[PDB]
Amino acid sequence: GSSGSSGQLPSYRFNPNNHQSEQTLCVVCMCDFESRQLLRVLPCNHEFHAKCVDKWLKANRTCPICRADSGPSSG
């Protein structure tokens, strides 16, 4: 039913209170995300760093975790 996507990932600051995702880690820099930080979430239910994922996607338009084709690309 409802659908809508411009062509970019949702930007939000991690929350040490509400663990949106049971497990939150960055496969790019094998480092966890901190609160009040610009993070991103792949369309495959994966958390990443607005900076890391930005460097990865550039090289490979896919998920470095589940090699799940993300889809759209900023550049």
Closer residue to Zn ion (CB): 9 or 46: 46
Closer residue to Zn ion (CB): 24 or 44: 44
Rounded to a whole number of angstroms, the minimum distance from the CB of residue 56 to Zn ion is 9
Rounded to a whole number of angstroms, the minimum distance from the CB of residue 6 to Zn ion is 20
Binding site residues, Zn ion, CB under 5 A:
26, 28-29, 42, 44, 46, 49, 52, 63, 65-66, 68
Closer residue to Zn ion (CB): 15 or 31: 31
Residue for token pair 């084709």: 69
3-state DSSP of the chain: CCCCCCCCCCCEEECCCCCCCCCCCECCCCECCCECCEEEEECCCEEEECCHHHHHHHHCCCCCCCCCCCCCCCC
